[PDB]
Symmetry: C3
């Protein structure tokens, strides 16, 4: 009786814990990828500048 009840309480709580961990870690991930996306957006705009600048250098 008691062994089965504890082990099932373990199973259900553990399974909720696994979800919460991944949920929270994957949200941190999304947070860091956003920061590197912003950075890549800004790079790409700088490259677009150099492109026009290069074509203008010809002459």
């Amino acid at each position: 009786h008691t062994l089965k009840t504890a082990n099932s309480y373990t199973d259900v709580t553990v399974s909720n814990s696994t979800k919460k961990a991944i949920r929270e870690s994957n949200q941190y991930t999304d947070h860091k990828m956003h920061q590197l996306e912003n950075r890549l957006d800004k790079l790409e705009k700088r490259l677009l500048k150099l492109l026009a600048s290069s074509a203008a250098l010809n002459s």
Copy 2:
């Protein structure tokens, strides 16, 4: 009966919880590798376009 029962149940907890810590770290590390491919591919492209442009 009951210290035997407490002990058995805690041993169950220990192996189940640790496997789950490992499980959660594996899936999150996988999701992160997924988001890293897309970021690194974007940067690969940018350096390629700068090199071409040069």
Copy 3:
């Protein structure tokens, strides 16, 4: 009771687990993001340099 004690042990163990997995996943994500940031810093620097010498050449000419 034995059940109450077993379940309390389970709650502390699981809570410590959640904290540990999140910490370790996040440390991973931090190392992978730091590597890219490094790559990205080098290119930022090259671009600023190429932009200023082309923006200089334009002005001169």
